[PDB]
Amino acid sequence: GKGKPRGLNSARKLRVHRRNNRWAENNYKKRLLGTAFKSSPFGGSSHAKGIVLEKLGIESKQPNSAIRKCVRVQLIKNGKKVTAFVPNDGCLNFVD
Amino acid sequence: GRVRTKTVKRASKALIERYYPKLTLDFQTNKRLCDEIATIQSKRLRNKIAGYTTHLMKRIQKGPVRGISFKLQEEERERKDQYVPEVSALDLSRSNGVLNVDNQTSDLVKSLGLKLPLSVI
Amino acid sequence: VLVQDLLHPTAASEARKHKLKTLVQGPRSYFLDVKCPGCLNITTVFSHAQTAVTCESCSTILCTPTGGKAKLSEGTSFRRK
């Protein structure tokens, strides 16, 4: 019977078992639990302004050798300390 | 080791394939005959080819061996293909004119061919 | 065999199969008539009696209980009914 109920009057069992089994999905848990509104630094936003506290420099991970020239910026709304990344070459001079 | 190479092995068998009587049962007499028969560029090579050939010439005298095919092998077995036993060819013989059978075998006889000599055991 | 008659089995095939595996379900038992010595007093006895049958006239064992077919007494005669 493929391990699933197959009666014409057995729909609650499939509906319930679907409800628990979809919780294993990463997207299903991420959306319904609403962790983006609690633990995400951006708080469910595409952009976030902040204040440049200091200029930062980090080293690359294995098989690589560079300093990424990052920056530590405190978001305004949340007030959390968040590291950012200045993308283009020679762009730290613009920021301060 | 004295293991002969396949080159002298195959050529020697080919020599006896078409030349039974030419290779005599002695080494020296047919050693030069092998040179006269096959194009051999080395005196050493024809010496070993005749040595194996003479040794094979001795073994065939004792009896047939594998891979002989000497144009005379069929001569005996084409003569020895007509054994044809004169009378007792396992038919109407080996008994007192009656075939020894069993009870179940008799029921097979009474099926369609009951007109036969039977001897139920 | 791909082409065989499951609808008209031969006598040998039906006699070999179990009573529950034949073309039609039927018993394999039978009823026997046993007579005590001297008096006739015919009585019917099952093949698997499961008990010790006695003719009400004479207190004599006519068969002994057995897991398979019932074993009739030596001083008895049996006939198919």
Binding site: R6, G7 | - | L2, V3, L7, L23, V24, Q25
Partner: protein, 129 residues
């Protein structure tokens, strides 16, 4: 235990066809199975079935010609409407030209094409092709 009689009968028929056998012993017995065999006979997917009668359910022996490919049951018996016939035939049949979805309806047991012409619909039994 034994839940459906037609499911076992059709499975045995399919197994016999896969084994190159021209016969199969159907032994859950039913009237739906008999009617399911009659509609198969109407399109020539089987030969002749004769029902052995004991004082129990019964047995059926159907002679199979080498024309049937697959016969199955659709359990549970879904409440297919008259507009869902095309959807079922588009998921249980290889091609639209042949193949017959055998469904039970208030006018009896028959196939999908006859249901369209009679303009009636019922429960879906299975499929034959």
């Amino acid at each position: 235990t034994r839940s459906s009689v037609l499911a076992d009968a059709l499975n045995a028929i399919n197994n016999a066809e896969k084994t190159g056998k021209r016969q199969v012993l159907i032994r859950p017995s039913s009237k739906v199975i008999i009617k399911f065999l009659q509609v198969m006979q109407k399109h020539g997917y089987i030969g002749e079935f004769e029902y052995i009668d004991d004082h129990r359910s019964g047995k059926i022996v159907v002679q199979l010609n080498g024309r049937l490919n697959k016969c199955g049951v659709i359990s549970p018996r879904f409440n297919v409407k008259i507009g869902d016939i095309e959807k079922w035939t588009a998921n249980l049949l290889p091609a639209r030209q042949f193949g017959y979805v055998i469904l039970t309806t208030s006018a009896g047991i028959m196939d999908h094409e006859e249901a369209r012409r009679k303009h009636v619909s019922g429960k879906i039994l299975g499929f034959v092709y």
